[PDB]
Amino acid sequence: MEVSANELEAASSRMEMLQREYSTLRSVQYRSEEGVIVFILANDRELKFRPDDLQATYGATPEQLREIEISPSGLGVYFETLEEDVSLIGLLEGRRGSAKWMAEHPLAS
Template sequence: MTITDDAIQQAEARMATKRDHAYAIDARYNRGTKRVIVRLHSGLELAIPTYLIEGLTAATPDALAEIEVSPSGLGLHWPQLDVDLYVPALLEGQFGSKQWMARQLGATGGRSRSQAKCNAAKANGLKGGRPRKMQA
């Protein structure tokens, strides 16, 4: 199948009119702050710490620095890591899959150090703590 210049121009025109989401025009990795900086078409820049993004937590700075923005501006791709992100999802605070996000939220809740949690732990301790497991 041969793609003509006319077909390319029509596709580009369709793409330009269908953008109802924010889209990226540039993305880079800042080694000093360890953040991915995404510049949107509106001029807004997002600075996201890499530890918040699934697939980027243990990546090397060189791998993080190689970011590709999709032609539509709706996707970011790290070729060395085989990681893809959807830009509108980033704006909604979704930095990974549902399972990964649930694990992150669960880990944060388990580390909570509220006064209510301390009081509950003390009350449970006064009751003798956790019951011992009985062997069958």
């Protein structure tokens, strides 16, 4: 809304402040038992979301969800096998994928 450009550093400052505000992702365990991807936080908080729920993993195999890395922002996750990212802040907001993904690929809910 403000008449500004780049120097505002808004989105960059957000990501950094979101690490210290909520948490960073330390580990992930795909539980074949529950059929869910459990995102373990730096406070040991287990965010429990399904592959069929998330954009990164919508129709992805369990083996691809064993070989997982943390996001380039350090917030969420980056499944390098899939070349996909599950944004941690998005999980907290319910934003399990992009706005276009959630509108054009609606979850059975």
